[PDB]
């Protein structure tokens, strides 16, 4: 058994389905609160009514004192003889130390961290795990709030990514019968402000495996040897755990064309990119890990990151068409109080170039302009002012109709 | 007069004291042990004193270690880098808000 | 409000346990702990 599911999800309960000032929600959150208070009371009584204790077996303190109080951590490198291994400290100073008993001489292996004494400097224990606080921090444990209900309609893309990352888990009977390996790599590309990170959030919200999230220009350190090692440890911790998934965002900071030039720092960038490229698909194995990689311009990527076998599915997010604008407007104004006058038809049809974030900004600007004159309900002229007065930076082309 | 001289004598007594190291916590442990990372180099397992509870201790914090025997001394302000001086303007002898005009 | 506050409280009241030192069963320790392990710190030297 590996570290197992190691699931990452708070996700207490979302049922606020009334979504208004109804009694059902009040009674439901009452049930939630009283269960939480009940569990708290149980743990208080669990910790308060413990009467049994000796817990030293008249020798545990003996072992504790035999080993030094401020034990230090070192790196074993060889074991020439029984009871006379050879270790080293941080500064690279080796020492022909001894090995004492009360240390299971089974799990020690060259390259493993061990616990050492001060005054005599012998081996007295083995440190079980060593993960720096740059990889454990990357992990997520509280799921973000959104879900598929909020997406404005992307049926093709949603179905695609679901066949990629979700379906092989819940119902893995078909793929064996057909004899196929499910795809492992996905690219999300397109113009800015369209929804590339929404699918990341929505997938992370509802899943069962570990989720790891990394942003692009963070795999970089200045000591010439930390980048690739950090990448290696990242994939190691992902694979020792559950069927996790990794989300690398804003890649183009890492991978770009691998050309030859002068400066040494850029050589370091290329070295790190190339190490990741090996890690993803190199020699023997890969493991049960999926990778999602998101960017807003794709042509400037190294041809060795995009070839199939490493990234199997590519998904383009295009600008919304007139069918989708109505859905977006219906979602972002659902919890808004609103007047009988307005019709979203004019706003959606008058313009032909805008995206999801733009619609959200139009909604909030119009609502605020309605507030400006001491009202709550929103009218049509407010939406008109919101659309036209701001939310539009411009561009020019094809002058004066050369074509007719 | 007696109080004043007593105070001064006590201060001089206190200044005759040894320093202490500062260390970053990477994680706690069980039965009153912490894993720390002293600044020059080192990865130690240290013990806490009697006036600090472990539940106060969380990863990535600053603790003070007694230099004599490596014990938890106390918990102190969390980390920042040197460049904070230019940030966070501290006094604003600046212009008013009504001298804009137009 | 108080939901999230009590969440914070209940998660703090939980920490971890280790049992990761590699100590062997006591039978393996034998009485060697006193006999030779105690008689092993002082006789030898580091020998860099």
């Amino acid at each position: 058994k590996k570290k197992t599911k190691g699931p990452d999800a708070a996700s207490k309960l979302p049922l606020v389905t009334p979504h208004t000032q109804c009694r059902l929600k009040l009674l439901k959150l009452e049930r939630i609160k009283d269960y939480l208070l009940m569990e708290e009371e149980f743990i208080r009584n669990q910790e308060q009514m413990k009467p049994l204790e000796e817990k030293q077996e008249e020798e545990r303190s003996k072992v504790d004192d035999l080993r030094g109080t401020p034990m230090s951590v070192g790196t074993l490198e060889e074991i020439i003889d029984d009871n006379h291994a050879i270790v080293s400290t941080s500064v690279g100073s080796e020492h022909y130390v001894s090995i004492l008993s009360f240390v299971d001489k089974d799990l020690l292996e060259p390259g493993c961290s061990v616990l050492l004494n001060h005054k005599v400097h012998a081996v007295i224990g083995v440190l079980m795990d060593d993960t720096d606080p740059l990889v454990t921090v990357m992990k997520v444990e509280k799921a973000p709030q959104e879900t598929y209900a909020d997406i404005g309609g992307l049926d093709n893309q949603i179905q695609e990514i679901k066949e990629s990352v979700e379906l092989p888990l819940t119902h893995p009977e078909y793929y064996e019968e057909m004899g196929i390996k499910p795809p492992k790599g996905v690219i999300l590309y397109g113009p800015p402000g369209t929804g590339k990170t929404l699918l990341a959030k929505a997938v992370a919200n509802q899943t069962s495996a570990t989720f790891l999230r990394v942003v692009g220009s963070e795999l970089i350190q200045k000591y010439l040897g930390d980048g690739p090692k950090l990448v290696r440890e990242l994939f190691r911790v992902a694979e020792e755990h559950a069927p996790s998934i990794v989300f690398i965002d804003e890649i183009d900071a890492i991978g770009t064309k691998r050309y030859d030039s002068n400066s040494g720092g850029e050589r370091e960038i290329q070295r790190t990119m190339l190490e990741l490229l090996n890690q993803l698909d190199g020699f023997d194995s890969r493991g049960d890990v999926k990778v999602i990689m998101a960017t807003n311009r794709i042509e400037t990527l190294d041809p060795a990151l995009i070839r199939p076998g490493r990234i199997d599915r590519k998904i383009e997010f295009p600008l919304p068409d007139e069918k989708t604008k109505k859905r977006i407007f219906q979602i972002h104004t659902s919890r808004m109080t609103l007047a009988d006058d307005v019709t979203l038809d004019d706003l959606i049809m008058a313009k032909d170039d805008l995206s999801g974030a733009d619609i959200k900004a139009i909604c909030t600007e119009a609502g605020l302009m309605a507030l400006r004159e001491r009202r709550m309900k929103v009218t049509n002229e407010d939406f008109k002012k919101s659309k036209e007065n701001v939310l539009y930076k411009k561009q020019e082309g094809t002058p004066e109709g050369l074509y007719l | 007069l007696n109080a004043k001289v007593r105070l001064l004598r006590e201060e001089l007594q206190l200044l005759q004291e040894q320093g202490s190291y500062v260390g970053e916590v990477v994680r706690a442990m069980d039965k009153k042990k912490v894993l720390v990372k002293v600044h020059p180099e080192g990865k130690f397992v240290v013990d806490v004193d009697k006036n600090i509870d472990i539940n106060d201790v969380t990863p990535n914090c600053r603790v003070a270690l007694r230099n004599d025997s490596y014990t938890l001394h106390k918990i102190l302000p969390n980390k920042v880098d040197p460049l904070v001086s230019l940030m966070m303007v501290e006094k604003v002898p600046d212009s008013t808000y009504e001298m804009i005009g137009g | 409000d108080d939901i999230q506050q009590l969440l914070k409280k209940i998660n703090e009241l939980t920490g971890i346990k280790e049992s990761d030192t590699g100590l062997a069963p006591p039978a393996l320790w034998d009485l060697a702990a006193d006999k030779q392990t105690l008689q092993s710190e002082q006789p030898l030297q580091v020998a860099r």
Partner: peptide, 26 residues
């Protein structure tokens, strides 16, 4: 080809110091 380039850095190894031995041999 003008230069606006940058570079990484290797560490400073010299950090060790001697300490008084405290062996107890009769």
């Amino acid at each position: 080809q003008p230069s606006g380039n940058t570079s990484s850095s290797a560490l400073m190894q010299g950090q060790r110091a001697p300490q008084k031995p405290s062996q107890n041999l009769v």
